[PDB]
Design a protein around this ligand. Structure first.
Ligand SMILES: *[C@@H]1O[C@H](CO)[C@@H](O)[C@H](O)[C@H]1NC(C)=O
Lengths: 49, 50
């Protein structure tokens, strides 16, 4: 299980074959990756005034 | 920008498509490609970009 926190617009980059800023410099998946990807909003936990 | 019923078309030529300078300014919610994989964009040269 690999866990992290990313912006809501960059959730689409956590997929095989994607490109962008997260997929190029931060976290990249293999082309023959097997397994699942789960992502949920946490605005009431990781954000503060 | 232009309205959707009067969408603006612009020709692009004689340039180098780096697209890494957009990482600081804007974040794209939708980005799809048809006929070419996104990871192969840095290894290609195009003919008429519109
Ligand atoms: C662009 O990057 C600089 C530092 O590299 C940063 O201070 C600035 O906020 C960035 N631009 C935007 C619109 O966030």
């Amino acid at each position: 299980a690999d866990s992290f926190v990313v912006r809501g617009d960059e959730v689409r980059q956590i997929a095989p074959g994607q490109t962008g800023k997260i997929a190029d410099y931060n976290y990249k998946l293999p082309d023959d990756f097997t397994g699942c990807v789960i992502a949920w909003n946490s605005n009431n936990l990781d954000s503060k005034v | 920008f232009a309205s959707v019923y009067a969408w603006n078309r612009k020709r692009i030529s004689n340039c180098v498509a780096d697209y890494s300078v957009l990482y600081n300014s804007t974040s794209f919610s939708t980005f799809k490609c048809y006929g070419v994989s996104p990871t192969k964009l840095n290894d290609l040269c195009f003919t008429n970009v519109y």
